[PDB]
Amino acid sequence: SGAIYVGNYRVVNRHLATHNDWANLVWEDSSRDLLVSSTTAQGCDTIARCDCQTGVYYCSSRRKHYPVSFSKPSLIFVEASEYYPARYQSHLMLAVGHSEPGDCGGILRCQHGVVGIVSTGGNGLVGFADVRDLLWLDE
């Protein structure tokens, strides 16, 4: 689990969005596994606006933060699951690192702030859904 709280928005993995998230939907994208909903309280997370390829992510399955080198957001084939059929997820970044079902939601951060959240994994590789291009989250 996990979410990004910026201004009056909450960003979660689309496959984990709650009834409250859908009832207050701002934007969702199945191809990116992202959902954004509105909040009444103010969020203080800072979104990175950069092209960083290094950062640190939180891995709940190990209660530890790990420094990673990651790829530029792209279209990557993601194996079938109970939430989605086998498809190409867009705006996805891979890193060599630990993850397991339950780690989605952990934040990836660089020196500029929040880069994205855990969305995929397997084979000793962790995938992160990029959020840096969602310029509207700050305005």
Ligand SMILES: Cc1nc2ccccc2n1CC(=O)N1CCC[C@H](C(N)=O)C1
């Ligand atoms: C996060 C993770 N690490 C894993 C390691 C090994 C095996 C599975 C692992 N998952 C879960 C996974 O990849 N899923 C399930 C939920 C929907 C995700 C999606 N964005 O399509 C795909």
Ligand SMILES: [Zn+2]
């Ligand atoms: Zn950065």
